[PDB]
Amino acid sequence: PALWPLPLSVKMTPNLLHLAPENFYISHSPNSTAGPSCTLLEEAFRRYHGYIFTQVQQLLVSITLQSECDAFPNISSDESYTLLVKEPVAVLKANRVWGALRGLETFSQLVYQDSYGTFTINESTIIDSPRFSHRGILIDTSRHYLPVKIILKTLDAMAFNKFNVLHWHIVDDQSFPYQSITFPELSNKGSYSLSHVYTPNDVRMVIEYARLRGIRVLPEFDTPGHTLSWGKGQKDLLTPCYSDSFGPINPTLNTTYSFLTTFFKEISEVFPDQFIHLGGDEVEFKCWESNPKIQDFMRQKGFGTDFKKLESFYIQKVLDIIATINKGSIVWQEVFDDKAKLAPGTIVEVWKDSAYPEELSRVTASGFPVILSAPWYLDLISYGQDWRKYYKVEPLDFGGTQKQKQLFIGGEACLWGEYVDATNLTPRLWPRASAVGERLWSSKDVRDMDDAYDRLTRHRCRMVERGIAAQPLYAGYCN
Amino acid sequence: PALWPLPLSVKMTPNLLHLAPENFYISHSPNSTAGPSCTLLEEAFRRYHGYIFTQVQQLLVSITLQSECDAFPNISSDESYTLLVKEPVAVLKANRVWGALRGLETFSQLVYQDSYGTFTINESTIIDSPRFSHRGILIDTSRHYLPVKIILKTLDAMAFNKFNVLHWHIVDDQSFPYQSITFPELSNKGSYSLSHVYTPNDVRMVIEYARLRGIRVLPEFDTPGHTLSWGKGQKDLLTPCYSDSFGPINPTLNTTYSFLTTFFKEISEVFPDQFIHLGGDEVEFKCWESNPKIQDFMRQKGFGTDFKKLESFYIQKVLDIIATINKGSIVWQEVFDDKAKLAPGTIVEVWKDSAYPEELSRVTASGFPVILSAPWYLDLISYGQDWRKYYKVEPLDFGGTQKQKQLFIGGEACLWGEYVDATNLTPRLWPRASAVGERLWSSKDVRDMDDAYDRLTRHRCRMVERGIAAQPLYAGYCN
Ligand SMILES: *[C@@H]1O[C@H](CO)[C@@H](O[C@@H]2O[C@H](CO)[C@@H](O[C@@H]3O[C@H](CO)[C@@H](O)[C@H](O)[C@@H]3O)[C@H](O)[C@H]2NC(C)=O)[C@H](O)[C@H]1NC(C)=O
């Protein structure tokens, strides 16, 4: 049995137990607060049965507190569980449905076949819970359109890896595949074609599918930069340049914040998750500055020719729109770095590789929750075993007091879409993102390279077996 | 119509012609030297018909010289053809079957559908032939075992790209998947498992399949280094180390050259191609030197403690074995660089990235035919549009007289198997190898980056359409 990520506490015995496919149930212990009526658990029981294939007859699942079956996971969902692997009835015990889903994955990783076909598990006890609560994968469905199928498999692979946030970078300069109901033109004119679109029903599917796995779907609607496609269905939203044609959203018109309010109100209803990622990265001033109506606004606010001041103005106003619909904001570092005024609990995401520990220190010294992604740019491929580099990151090596560190809520592996699509996305992501997943779940001090190597190669074969085309770590084979 | 690689001469007119799927034949002109009895051409006609889907009724194919239907391509096979695209009957005219196969690919790339579905081709004339005759892809089926299927698709993708040599690096340190009939133990004990093997019938298939496409299958049986797996089924073949256990083949025993003669005689019958690649790269001396029976041989030949002298001894003896069965040798630069005596027409393959133009000059100054692969290590992946780097290579920028340059016979894109297998091989290879293919086929002076970009993105969609999962070049979509 290969475990990935490696649970917080594992105690095994040398007593072997066996399982009979046509004769082994997973079900609710009579004391569980969840029962048959509970889809999320029901579907899990069935799909894991499949994954899995001196007696163990059964795995009882006991949800201790109110199960939250019908809810969406959020930031502080309880993921803890325990596993007592014993004859004749094994037990998975969790506070909440979210714990149970994690535990089921761990249990599956413990069943295995000996040289003769026999399904075997060791007597053991497992105590487990995540080291960090925000465990993301970022996907880019604008640079390339990812079909819904491929998004779902990703969700499956994320489950197998205990990741819990799908950071959906849904739109960008190149294409606007999100179909909006109050704004039909955005996608009609900005999508790559009528069949590179996510309908409200595609969005619905992805969301449910992720929920059923304890995954949160965090939408990113990046502004004011990276918004070239928004302009095709929105008259007057983008700044016109005086010489490129268009630059960032024009932050000086009422019509602009008008639209943005309507829009984000729709978003706030479509995506159940607490947070909206607002982007705010990489905004070009060269354009705003060549433009005379902006010139004029700069004069009227006395902003000089510091265009950060204007980036601030805009972003802050959007921040307020988000606050007004009672949602949280996430924001790329640039927003913080350019000193906009942020509400308490705004999450800042540190993505710039340049001395990010000092970034982490600054953000946390300001008292904001912080998410790391900088050393985890997976689109940034290179030769050989780079998973090691990702795995060896210690997110908490920065200067900062205890309370400061408590503000670090986790991180994301990023796969940006410039060079990625259906043809290459999976082998590119996996197992490389696994290294990231284990570091974000297991202990601080889980770091033997040889052992990591060993479980990872075996985990990867498992993934392949479950139809994730994850790529090799090094020379070898499966079975 | 996107062309790749771009034929030597293309003359188009603005007259459009149309094609009717259920009504368009490719067949033999009555004067062709090939007719129905000719499988290679028959199968081509059918498979291209499929690829393809004011009138063009037909494409007549005229083979001018003896067709060579039943032969294997070799180094100097005639690949030239012409294409007269006219109503009502178009004409493909080639000296040989090999030309015809190229031409058919070009014709397919010229048919296309307008906005209304209509199959269209422009009136045009095409004159085409390759700038270099050796156009390889190297695959590694030892670091990972590639199933026969995936080898075949590669062969298909190579055809679509006019590549004509599959450099089969079949065995290496990690695994010996080649099943040998005079040596059953080699694969029984050296393969990854009984089901990671190439049977004589797998080899037969691959060979025919490539032949049917004008592809030569060049086997590499690398020695004396990279031979760790040979040892599991061959007692006494590998040097034992005195402290790793085993090092390179022990070049001092008779039993060694005994085996190697039997073996290469089997190879010489199994693989139809003229050349055998002998490897000869990266041989470690640290082992031979720790060993006392080698020590003793060194003394008896008065080789001092220059172990190149012994690498020479061995390799030369193998060279003679090859010569004795009337086959050609190919050899990695190290063999030349360590000054072994080579027969006239031994091909040296330059693979080391360190100032290879001066390597090219030295080899060609010695009068040997030379093959470049150094700037074309495709396993050496990196971020972004690296196809450009590959495409911009000018193989002939080295110092050397005309006659010297005439010795440069071509090159290979290499995909070594340390990090590669079925899960990632195709998107890794394609379209990156396309850049290599065009540079090895088209003119010296075909090099507009924008145009290359444009045809390549379109070529790549074609490949995807024909079920090659080739990866993107940059942001965008197909159709
Ligand atoms: C899960 O259960 C399996 C099966 O009990 C455990 O594997 C077994 O481990 C013992 C060591 O505790 C092996 O015994 C050994 O015998 C040889 C002499 O032949 C010697 O090298 C050692 O000193 C040792 O006594 C036993 O072979 C081994 N494997 C099997 C298949 O029975 C396994 O350790 C348990 N896993 C965990 C993580 O607890």
Ligand SMILES: *[C@@H]1O[C@H](CO)[C@@H](O[C@@H]2O[C@H](CO)[C@@H](O[C@@H]3O[C@H](CO)[C@@H](O)[C@H](O)[C@@H]3O)[C@H](O)[C@H]2NC(C)=O)[C@H](O)[C@H]1NC(C)=O
């Ligand atoms: C293959 O045949 C097609 C169809 O004839 C050729 O495309 C056509 O090219 C002409 C230019 O020769 C286009 O005419 C243009 O008209 C506009 C005014 O509306 C003006 O911008 C130009 O000065 C020019 O006169 C025509 O639209 C165009 N396309 C089609 C679909 O008919 C094509 O060039 C041929 N390809 C090659 C490589 O020869």
Ligand SMILES: CCc1nc(N)nc(N)c1-c1ccc(Cl)cc1
């Ligand atoms: C937040 C940065 C960012 N934002 C957007 N909208 N797109 C991107 N492609 C990136 C990016 C930055 C660095 C690398 Cl190496 C790769 C991608």
Ligand SMILES: CCc1nc(N)nc(N)c1-c1ccc(Cl)cc1
């Ligand atoms: C001829 C060199 C060679 N021979 C063998 N048998 N295996 C290899 N993997 C390589 C190799 C060398 C450099 C790179 Cl970058 C990648 C692979």
Ligand SMILES: *[C@@H]1O[C@H](CO)[C@@H](O)[C@H](O)[C@H]1NC(C)=O
């Ligand atoms: C623009 O903004 C102000 C205050 O924010 C608003 O009330 C006003 O009517 C708007 N003006 C125009 C000209 O659209």
Ligand SMILES: *[C@@H]1O[C@H](CO)[C@@H](O)[C@H](O)[C@H]1NC(C)=O
């Ligand atoms: C080894 O080599 C020689 C000559 O090449 C051969 O004739 C001889 O009999 C061999 N000796 C042994 C001891 O195997």
